[PDB]
């Protein structure tokens, strides 16, 4: 039965008392003066009362009330009675902006009863308790306002100009006259011809912020509706910004939408937009040592050394992508969204390290084997079940060569390297693809371009059957193929040989 | 190719190396299937006819193929786009999406009840005034990806590369784009002071890329060589190098800033606010030509002044 | 109506709150977003540093104020030392968790308190629309490391059925005593 | 009390995306500014490095 009141800038939300101080002179303030402070509204400060009186009321004059129209009319009459020739015809927002500018110009920090609206310390208290009432988005907007406006002025102005501005803040005649005697204070003030560079610096910073905040949602909409119609390289070409900048804009916009809504962000998105960059750059780093970067993955011969290696590289780059995304043909096997979240989430560093070249899958299907009969019966049926998985691999003369690794793990090879795994429940199954590749030397590269269904097959790549007939494979001259075919077929006929004679169906005497 | 084989067969002219390079790079730049296989045929015709194969040709072949990989990927993705368009037009007439729109599995297995019947923890709903909720509503309520364009582009590519098709697709999605043409593009390659600041010192913004308040690059609060003073001094030195480039005529004259105008002599500020000058060159034209301005002190445009043409240019 | 994980926060890194946070960080595999509150941010940074170095299965997030802990979490779990600290964190502060509770939040208090404190906590949480469970824990921090703690949950029964998969990550004998105040 | 002393003096935060080298190198299209460091390493190693 409690209604939460809506909080905004007009009435601030109440905060705790153990909060840290935002401004530097308040952190070393003694605690007695901290307890001296009273909980007042934001306009009870004299600077806040000034800002509500002459700035915020003029911004409220832009609405459709009648008293706003009367104040707009008397402000137009006032500014025309000042001088008519300078502001002959302008709208109500123009006179509002002009009087807001003129009242921002005439702000000074003196005594409250001497004719000045507020003191310097009241302004510092307003800044401290205004920064204390900010969230993370409020602090982000404060830093963005610092970067857009105050940062070019600080980049251009000299520190003696900062001391002059501080003397203008404190407004003490003794401090101003103590600064005015110094010749190096008066001579080292900046020239307006050098101060005009702050406009171009401010324009460049606001141009980068316009790249981020204005073009960002348009890029995000065009990429999130149809990514196969507008890929990031197409957006990078049609807007001309950059490739990595467009991808960083997309990642920043999704993470900014997730963080501002109290939602855990989709961590798979930097793995999906920077996939090659995730495999290349993202490493685990230890503390007390420096690392390097590999220029190449392998010590190889160049493709410019021969014309045939050059033609092979050009034909492979024809059959390759330039950038691969989540919707392309190598990622077409992810037919269920559960497989999508399993591949792109928390195991992408394992799933990409399975096979170097991108294939139509990630591993190999697992099949199980039959158990040989144990003639002791149920006396020894317990002994195969154990605690752990028992993995057994083959070695020998034919088996265990690193140069023939993709041939010894080929399931279409009749001399395949035999692996077996006994489960703790006694099941004999074959090994997985990573389980088969774990017994060889490490292969720690990846191909993110070549896709084998994109190979050319009609003009130059034409494999002929006459080239395979040049080896002259014959069955009468060599009978190994027929012997392996005899070894493959079942031997059930050997027992019903006496039961040319050809095998027929059993003739029934009951129906005949 | 027609003019090429008419030159070779009919007029028996031996083509030069440049027109062989043109037929190589035309098939390489075209993203259609087999352009590399025909560029290698032109390479073979260069090899067996005595035409010189330069290494610059090979490096340009690799560079042009890697550049036209984008066109190849666009022409490959357009085929899957047309397949999905035909499948969408089929399944919207068969009516399987009408049967799939009814969430009978969500009705039987509710969000608060699991498969067995226990109560599970449901996450709280976000505020509808947030950005993520509006993005999900824009994902659900807008039109499909297959209804944006009926036909594809002129040469093998999907539509949406130009700005007219982009603006039409955004109109179909209910979005009025702020950037209608390429004149309203910020173009960060035109920046000169900002990449110079980003290269030597560092990022002057810092809070441009900040997710939750920790990815900001700002100087430390203690001081010393990492503090704000040395960073602002080095930024002022870089802006001083750029202003020295302005003074020597390598860079254009910057316009009048508010910080520059507020530090000037008050008579110059009065002349600027009565003349409306943006650059100090306009202020110099306002002062050195007092008969050019209007009666309210306003500055006349440049086209309303005509200098005296001397007769000595008629020599 | 966004399909997402559960935001679970642990308030107070003390003698018993740190193994509760470590059990929630280890045994929850991508099923929750973990939030860690402390009065000093360096203590929450140390807890998240040890959880990330030892290897946790969820992402974690530090907090310094109770308002962000209230606006972020779907489930809040308090494991503090004194009844004064729990009464300050739940009722007495201006940004306190029960007084600013959103509609549908669940606040479980593991700190052993008096009867009237839990009564007023459950009453004001039901007035705000949220849910309050009081579940005083019995066991050592080594027993909390092994996942064997005794919990006596008072509050709603459906809320207890919802909170049993979180309770089973750090506590073994979890009983539902009945209404609020029985545990 | 035995856990409060043993802090993380062993690990470090990972490399961000599009990061540079500790020597100043980066993965760009122009590798003239980047250099190799295989000639600074010792010529023979007793054993096998992880790279």
């Amino acid at each position: 039965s409690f209604d939460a009141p809506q909080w905004d800038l007009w009435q601030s939300r109440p905060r705790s008392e153990d909060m840290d101080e935002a401004l530097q002179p308040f952190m070393d303030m003694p605690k007695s003066l901290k307890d001296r402070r009273y909980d007042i509204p934001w306009w009870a400060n004299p600077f806040g009362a000034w800002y509500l009186q002459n700035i915020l009321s003029l911004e409220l004059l832009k609405l459709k009330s009648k008293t706003n129209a009367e104040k707009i009319a008397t402000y137009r009459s006032y500014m025309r009675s000042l001088a008519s020739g300078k502001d002959n015809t302008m709208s109500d927002d123009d006179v509002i902006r002009n009087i807001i500018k003129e009242r921002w110009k005439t702000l000074e920090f003196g005594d409250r009863n001497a004719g000045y609206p507020c003191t310097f310390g009241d302004y510092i208290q307003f800044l401290n308790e205004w920064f204390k009432s900010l969230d993370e988005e409020g602090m982000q907007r404060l830093r963005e306002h610092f970067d857009r406006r105050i940062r070019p002025l600080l980049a251009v102005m000299s520190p003696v100009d900062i001391l002059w501005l501080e003397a203008l803040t404190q407004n003490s005649p003794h401090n101003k006259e103590q600064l005015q005697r110094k010749i190096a204070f008066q001579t080292s003030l900046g020239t307006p011809e050098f101060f005009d560079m702050s406009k171009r610096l401010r324009y460049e910073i606001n141009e980068d912020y316009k790249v981020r905040d204005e073009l960002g949602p348009e890029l995000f909409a065009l990429w999130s509706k149809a990514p196969e119609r507008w890929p990031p390289e197409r957006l990078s070409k049609m807007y001309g910004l950059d490739f990595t900048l467009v991808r960083k804009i997309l990642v920043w916009h999704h993470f900014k939408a997730c963080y501002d809504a109290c939602v855990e962000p989709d961590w798979s998105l930097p793995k999906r937009l920077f996939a090659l960059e995730w495999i290349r750059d993202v490493r685990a780093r230890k503390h007390g040592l420096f690392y390097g970067k590999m220029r190449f993955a392998e010590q190889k011969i160049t493709f410019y050394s021969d014309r045939f290696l050059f033609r092979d590289l050009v034909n492979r780059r024809e059959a390759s992508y330039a950038n691969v995304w989540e919707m392309d043909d190598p990622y077409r096997f992810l037919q269920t969204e559960q497989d999508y979240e399993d591949y792109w989430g928390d195991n992408y560093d394992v799933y990409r390290r399975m096979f170097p070249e991108m294939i139509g899958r990630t591993g190999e299907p697992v099949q199980q084997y039959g158990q040989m009969p144990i003639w002791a019966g149920p006396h020894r049926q317990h002994a195969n079940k154990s605690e752990h998985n028992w993995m057994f691999a083959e070695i020998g003369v034919n088996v265990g060569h690193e140069a023939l690794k993709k041939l010894e793990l080929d399931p279409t090879n009749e001399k395949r390297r035999r692996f077996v795994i006994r489960q703790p429940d006694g099941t004999l199954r074959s090994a997985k693809m990573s389980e088969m590749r774990a017994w060889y030397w490490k292969e720690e590269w990846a191909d993110f371009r070549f896709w084998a269904p994109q190979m050319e097959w009609g003009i130059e790549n034409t494999p002929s059957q006459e080239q395979y007939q040049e080896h002259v494979p014959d069955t009468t001259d060599a009978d190994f193929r027929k012997q392996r075919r005899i070894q493959s077929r079942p031997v059930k006929w050997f027992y019903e040989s006496h039961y040319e004679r050809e095998v027929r169906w059993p003739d029934v005497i009951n129906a005949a | 190719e027609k003019l090429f084989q008419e030159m070779i067969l009919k007029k028996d002219l031996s083509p030069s190396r440049r027109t062989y390079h043109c037929m190589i790079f035309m098939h390489l730049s075209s993203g259609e299937e087999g352009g590399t296989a025909r560029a290698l045929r032109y390479l073979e015709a260069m090899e067996r006819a005595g035409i010189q194969v330069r290494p610059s040709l090979l490096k340009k072949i690799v560079r042009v193929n890697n550049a036209a990989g984008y066109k190849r990927d666009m022409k490959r993705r357009a085929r899957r786009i047309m397949q999905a368009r035909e499948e969408y037009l089929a399944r919207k007439e068969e009516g399987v999406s009408f049967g799939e729109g009814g969430k009978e599995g969500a009705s039987n297995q509710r969000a608060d009840v699991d498969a067995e019947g226990n109560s599970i923890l449901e996450p709280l709903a976000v505020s509808p005034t947030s950005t993520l909720a509006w993005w999900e509503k824009w994902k659900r309520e807008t039109v499909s990806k297959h209804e944006l364009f009926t036909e594809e582009g002129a040469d093998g590519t999907p539509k949406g590369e130009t700005f007219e098709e982009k603006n039409e697709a955004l109109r179909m999605m209910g979005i009025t784009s702020s950037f209608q043409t390429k004149d309203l593009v910020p173009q960060p390659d035109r920046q000169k002071l900002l990449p110079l600041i980003r290269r030597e010192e560092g990022e002057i913004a810092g809070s441009l890329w900040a997710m939750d308040g920790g990815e900001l690059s700002y100087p430390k609060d203690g001081g010393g060589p990492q503090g704000w003073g040395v960073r602002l001094w080095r930024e002022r030195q870089l802006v001083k190098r750029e202003y020295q480039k302005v003074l020597d005529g390598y860079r254009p004259v910057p316009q009048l800033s508010t910080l520059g105008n507020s530090v000037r002599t008050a008579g110059d500020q009065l002349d600027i606010e009565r003349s409306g000058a943006q650059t100090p060159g306009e202020l110099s034209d306002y002062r050195n030509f007092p008969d050019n301005r209007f009666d309210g002190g306003q500055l006349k445009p440049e086209s309303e002044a005509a200098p005296a043409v001397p007769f000595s240019a008629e020599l | 109506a966004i399909k997402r994980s559960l935001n679970v926060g642990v308030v107070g890194m003390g003698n018993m709150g740190v193994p509760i946070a470590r059990n929630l960080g280890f045994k929850a595999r991508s099923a929750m977003y973990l939030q860690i509150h402390s009065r000093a941010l360096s203590k929450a940074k140390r807890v998240c540093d040890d959880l990330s170095v030892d290897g946790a299965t969820c992402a974690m997030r530090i907090h310094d104020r109770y308002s962000t802990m209230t606006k972020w979490c779907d489930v809040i779990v308090l494991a503090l030392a004194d009844v004064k600290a729990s009464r300050h964190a739940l009722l007495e502060d201006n940004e306190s968790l029960i007084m600013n509770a959103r509609k549908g939040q669940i606040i479980v208090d593991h700190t052993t308190v008096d009867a009237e404190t839990s009564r007023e906590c459950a009453h004001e949480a039901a007035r705000r629309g949220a849910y309050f469970l009081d579940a005083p824990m019995s066991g050592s921090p080594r027993a909390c490391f092994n996942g064997q703690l005794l919990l006596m949950v008072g509050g709603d029964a459906e809320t207890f059925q919802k909170m049993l998969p979180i309770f089973h990550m750090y506590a073994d004998n979890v009983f539902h005593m009945g209404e609020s105040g029985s545990g | 009390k035995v856990d409060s002393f043993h802090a993380n003096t062993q690990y470090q935060h990972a490399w961000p995306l599009l990061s540079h080298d500790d020597l100043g190198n980066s993965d760009q299209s122009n590798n003239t500014k980047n250099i190799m460091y295989s000639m600074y390493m010792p010529k023979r190693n007793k054993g096998t490095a992880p790279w």
């Binding site: 840290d20 935002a22 401004l23 530097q24 952190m27 700035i55 902006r97 807001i100 500018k101 921002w104 110009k105 702000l107 920090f109 302004y123 510092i124 800044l127 920064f131 404060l142 830093r143 610092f146 857009r148 406006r149 105050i150 002025l153 600080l154 900062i162 501005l165 501080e166 203008l168 803040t169 606001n206 | 920790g214 900001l216 700002y218 100087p219 430390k220 609060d221 503090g227 704000w228 508010t258 910080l259 507020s262 530090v263 | 360096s42 140390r46 | 802090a7 993380n8």
Partner: peptide, 30 residues
């Protein structure tokens, strides 16, 4: 250990009177 600074020197630059030089910086940009 090491503590990341909350950048309090961002707030000391707002203590200056930027309205005297920029003529209404704290409002909305034109």
């Amino acid at each position: 250990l090491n503590e990341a600074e909350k950048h309090h020197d961002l707030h000391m630059f707002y203590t200056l009177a930027w309205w005297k030089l920029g003529e209404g910086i704290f409002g909305v940009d034109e």
